[PDB]
Ligand binder design. Structure first.
Ligand code: HEM
Ligand SMILES: O=C(O[C@H](Cn1ccnc1)c1ccc(Cl)cc1Cl)c1cccc(C(F)(F)F)c1
Length: 452
């Protein structure tokens, strides 16, 4: 009836230790010991892991009073704000908040986003000079921070950003949300709260200034390719006619940037590293760039939509190194899985890291090989063989923007620079909420066209 258990080391703490050591290695080991479904006690919580592509229907198809996101991720409240996202008054209200973000991620906006990528990267190359070495992860994090800001918030953020360490403030927020806050939501984190407050006042300022700009220049609000997420948030109410508060607006913005800061920057690092460490892969990538760019000197949205191989590379970095290593739901109702019934109160857990290495779906899963997808279609086997962006009702609404931003960044960097990585491809580091490459991650670079 109930699934098999992992025996607890001691009571209460249960399997925390080996889980904490390497949450991914933990799930593979015990999936062998106990099958496709098993439960473990981890710092007081019943956690049921579903580890086979074939059984993921139970997870992804449910509704939000069968399987709740809000019962598990509410602990993000200090970062996102009161009444926002998983602390929204209702599921329905959370969905509306999400649609405000997605409403600023239209085709029309995507055309302008590509220009933004070119601009930020052009400022960045001045700063890098014609040759050098650089930390890849830091570089990606900066480029993604400055470009997502401008994409979601409008260009008028940009001086504030340079001139008030927004990069740093996000580092301090991000460097005060431990995975252990899942288990103890009260773990005080005073630097985090300090940062968050600070970012809030800045976004307050920006919202006030945008209101004066909408006084004078309302024609802007008719133009599709000028409407950023800040604009949608000032001019839209909820479906039932209730107005949004500035606290909600700020919280949604912060969540929006947070979403696609770290995941997109990590994914661009893994992608770029594997691409330049493999001659074959880099040949095909460069070949594609050259076909698509022809005689044009800059990128645009149609060009990036043609980069199928670069995309496959990105997808392959997401199979091998997904930055959200675990996805979770709370059972508000007992729930059927295979021959078992997972009871109310259990947390269901699926891991895209475990899925990405399943020999049942992928041959030679430790090899970075974009051709497993483009040619062999290996992903297509099971319906849920590939879940880097999720599935069903809470699929990532940021996917197309992410793909757009990573592909653009890597394509532009390839255009400017020959690059070589230093050392072996690292392993993932399980020391934070969003999992990224273990430092050091460095690379040599050289400008492909010069003036000295
Ligand atoms: C490579 C980059 C990214 C990856 C790998 C990624 C991955 C994911 C995954 C796996 C989920 C499913 C979460 C779950 O089922 O519990 C998800 C959901 C989501 N992602 Fe992303 N994401 C990325 C970028 C973005 C960006 C840039 C944004 C926003 C600007 C975004 C916004 C969201 C939102 C709002 C959801 C919630 C969907 C819902 O509950 O309706 N993501 N993402
Ligand atoms: O940032 C977001 O979620 C990320 C996980 N993530 C990153 C990319 N895709 C998902 C997340 C969720 C829960 C926890 Cl405990 C930890 C993290 Cl890092 C997110 C989720 C819903 C809505 C929104 C927004 F308001 F902006 F629309 C943003």
């Amino acid at each position: 009836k109930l699934p098999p258990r992992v025996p607890n080391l001691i009571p209460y703490v249960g399997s925390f230790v080996s889980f904490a050591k390497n949450p991914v290695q933990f799930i593979i080991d015990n999936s062998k010991k106990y099958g496709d479904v098993f439960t473990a006690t981890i710092l007081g919580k019943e956690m049921t892991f579903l580890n086979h592509p074939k059984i993921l229907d139970t997870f992804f198809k449910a509704t939000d009073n069968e399987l709740s996101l809000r019962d598990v991720y509410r602990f993000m409240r200090p970062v996102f704000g009161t009444g926002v996202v998983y602390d929204a008054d209702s599921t329905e209200r959370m969905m509306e908040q999400v649609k405000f973000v997605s409403s600023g991620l239209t085709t029309a906006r995507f055309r302008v986003f590509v220009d933004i990528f070119e601009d930020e990267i052009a400022h960045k190359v001045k700063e890098l000079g014609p040759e050098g070495t650089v930390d890849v992860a830091e570089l990606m994090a900066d480029l993604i921070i400055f470009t997502a800001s401008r994409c979601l918030l409008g260009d008028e953020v940009r001086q504030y950003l340079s001139e008030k360490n927004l990069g740093k403030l996000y580092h301090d927020i991000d460097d005060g949300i431990s995975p252990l806050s899942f288990f103890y939501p009260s773990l005080p984190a005073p630097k985090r709260d300090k940062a968050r407050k600070a970012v809030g006042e800045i976004f307050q300022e920006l919202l006030d200034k945008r209101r004066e700009e909408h006084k004078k220049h309302p024609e802007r609000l008719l133009d599709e390719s000028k409407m950023d997420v800040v604009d949608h948030l000032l001019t839209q109410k909820y479906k039932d006619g209730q107005e949004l508060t500035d606290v909600h607006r700020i919280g949604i913005l912060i969540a929006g940037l947070f979403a696609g800061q770290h995941t997109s920057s990590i994914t661009s690092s893994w992608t770029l590293m594997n691409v330049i460490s493999n001659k074959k892969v880099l040949e095909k990538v460069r070949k594609e760039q050259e076909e698509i760019m022809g005689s044009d000197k800059v990128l645009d949205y149609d060009k990036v939509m043609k980069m199928d191989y670069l995309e496959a590379c990105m997808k392959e970095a997401l199979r091998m190194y997904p930055p959200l290593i675990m996805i979770m739901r709370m059972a508000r109702k007992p729930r059927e899985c295979e021959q078992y019934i997972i009871p109310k109160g259990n947390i269901l857990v699926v891991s895209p890291s475990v899925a990405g290495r399943c020999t049942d779906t992928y041959t030679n899963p430790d090899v970075f090989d974009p051709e497993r997808l483009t040619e062999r279609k290996e992903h297509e086997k099971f319906k849920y063989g590939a879940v880097p962006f999720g599935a069903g009702r809470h699929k990532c609404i940021g996917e197309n923007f992410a793909l757009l931003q990573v592909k653009s960044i890597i394509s532009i960097l390839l255009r400017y620079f020959d690059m070589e990585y230093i050392g072996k491809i690292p392993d993932p580091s399980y020391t934070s909420l969003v999992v990224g490459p273990s430092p050091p991650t460095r690379m040599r670079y050289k400008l492909r066209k010069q003036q000295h």
